[PDB]
From Swiss-Prot, chain A:
It comes from Saccharomyces cerevisiae (strain ATCC 204508 / S288c) (Baker's yeast). Functions as a scaffold that mediates the ordered assembly of spliceosomal proteins and snRNAs. Required for association of BRR2 with the spliceosomal U5 snRNP, and the subsequent assembly of the U4/U6-U5 tri-snRNP complex. Functions as a scaffold that positions spliceosomal U2, U5 and U6 snRNAs at splice sites on pre-mRNA substrates, so that splicing can occur. Interacts with both the 5' and the 3' splice site, as well as the branch region. Has a role in branch site-3' splice site selection. Associates with the branch site-3' splice 3'-exon region. Also has a role in cell cycle. The lineage of its organism: Eukaryota, Fungi, Dikarya, Ascomycota, Saccharomycotina. Present with 468 molecules/cell in log phase SD medium. Changing T104A: Reduced growth at 30 degrees Celsius. Strongly reduced growth at 16 degrees Celsius. The MPN (JAB/Mov34) domain has structural similarity with deubiquitinating enzymes, but lacks the residues that would bind the catalytic metal ion. Contains a region with structural similarity to reverse transcriptase, presenting the classical thumb, fingers and palm architecture, but lacks enzyme activity, since the essential metal-binding residues are not conserved. This is Pre-mRNA-splicing factor 8. Changing T23A: Reduced growth at 30 degrees Celsius. Strongly reduced growth at 16 degrees Celsius. Component of the U4/U6-U5 tri-snRNP complex composed of the U4, U6 and U5 snRNAs and at least PRP3, PRP4, PRP6, PRP8, PRP18, PRP31, PRP38, SNU13, SNU23, SNU66, SNU114, SPP381, SMB1, SMD1, SMD2, SMD3, SMX2, SMX3, LSM2, LSM3, LSM4, LSM5, LSM6, LSM7, LSM8, BRR2 and DIB1. It is found in: Nucleus. Residues 7-237 are annotated as: RNase H homology domain. It comes from the Eukaryota.
UniProtKB/Swiss-Prot annotation, chain B:
This is A1 cistron-splicing factor AAR2. Changing S236A: No effect on interaction with PRP8. Gene3D superfamilies: 2.60.34.20, Aar2, C-terminal domain-like. The modification Phosphoserine is found at S236. It comes from Saccharomyces cerevisiae (strain ATCC 204508 / S288c). InterPro entries: AAR2 (IPR007946), AAR2_C (IPR033648), AAR2_C_sf (IPR038514), Aar2_N (IPR033647), AAR2_N_sf (IPR038516). Belongs to the AAR2 family. Its main location: cytoplasm. Present with 7330 molecules/cell in log phase SD medium.
Amino acid sequence: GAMNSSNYAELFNNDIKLFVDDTNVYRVTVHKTFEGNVATKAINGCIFTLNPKTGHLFLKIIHTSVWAGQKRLSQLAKWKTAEEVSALVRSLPKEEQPKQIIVTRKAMLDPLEVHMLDFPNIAIRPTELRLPFSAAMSIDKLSDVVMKATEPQMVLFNIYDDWLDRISSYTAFSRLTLLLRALKTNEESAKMILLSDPTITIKSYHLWPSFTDEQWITIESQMRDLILTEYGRKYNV
Amino acid sequence: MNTVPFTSAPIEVTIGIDQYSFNVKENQPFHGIKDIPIGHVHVIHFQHADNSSMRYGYWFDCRMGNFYIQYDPKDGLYKMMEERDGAKFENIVHNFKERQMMVSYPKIDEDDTWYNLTEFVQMDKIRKIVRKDENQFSYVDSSMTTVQENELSDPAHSLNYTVINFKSREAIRPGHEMEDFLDKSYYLNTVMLQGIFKNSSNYFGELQFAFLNAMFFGNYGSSLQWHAMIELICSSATVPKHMLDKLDEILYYQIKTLPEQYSDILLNERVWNICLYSSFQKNSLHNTEKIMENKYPELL
Ligand SMILES: O=C(O)[C@@H](c1ccc(Cl)cc1)N1CCOCC1
């Protein structure tokens, strides 16, 4: 069935699962042609495949060459995503293969299901959560590796840095979704919050700054205020 | 012309034969239907006046034997049987005709409806979908399930239609996932037509048989099969031209014959809107689209 607020703790149990977000696979800039028509130019994209329990992020970089000479790119993008996820599962040892794959957008269900016919025991599920994974390209080090890529490439990250040494997966995912929701609602402000204090640095092998437990509470509170601020700016409340 | 005599009519029942329906009262002096056109399969079907649960009936071809109906008070239904003694059968039929106890099959001469609904239906193929090999006729009813329904429970009483499933390894070639899911031509032409059915005529025979079981018995699994076989053709970008033109004729006569009052349960809104307006063959079913739009515009 579909994943939602009631079975939310299922994300952090011991059954391997992956979230797949395809919202940054096919990315374009829209522009005017010399003749005054409109055209698109693709830029590099990425599939965001995440184990919410461990923080392991399988970032498949989608190079613009994969669109060359193809039609109906937004539809192809869903099937290309499904093909790459299937190839990732086949590459993993049996005991690391997921038992469930949760897609963040319902249009991914049929493409992924068809590509995974060989894995009838892997459940493909939608979700009613509105997860902010599109904002992954607001993380500077992920954006940088995507834009610099000159060929298809898979890059592995832990999107929780070392947090699981100190907090639970449930709390780590809550933090990540709050960070990503903030970066999605007001990227500039969110980044300002995250970096205002220059004495707190991002280790070379990490994505986010090395906050103490106390400083994370402060940060998390600032991100809530940002989200509430934008919500009032938007709705005039 | 041929005859299906009845031993008697002990219980009140609506008897239908092909697309026709009529009433027999409890212990009315009824002894069968005569003047049945040779050359076609036929279906004789029943709905008891006192329990409309279970429509049931028999597919048969009079060229294959002499058949009659006899009520069984233990099992509670009108049963078809074969009479092997041909002299006895002619004698029985001649006497009931002389007593004019047989109702006359009302085949209007201008009418090709039954031919058009059964053009590709052959008794030998019916007998593979409905397995009961000691008889030359085939029993079907409201509640019988299909092989595919039982996969998702008595197998002996099942409808063994050809399983169609658009998200199955049979439908989808490894490495052509997107191609094959969006254009079913491989599955239609190589898997089904070349591989399983051998030719378009056997494919159309199963499709027509499925429609007729849906309409006459309200058999839900047959309705599912009829729609699946339509959608497989309509969702294929490459279909022989002769199949498309025939499909349009087939569906036209099926829509024309459908009771208006049953359209709500026998017609799947999604399949028909997809086939007529979205599919590859959206422009290849002119007659079917015209009748659907004039007769059931609500569905669309
Ligand atoms: O519809 C018809 O033409 C006749 C009819 C149908 C089937 C048989 Cl085998 C015989 C006669 N009906 C009779 C009852 O109701 C009037 C019409």
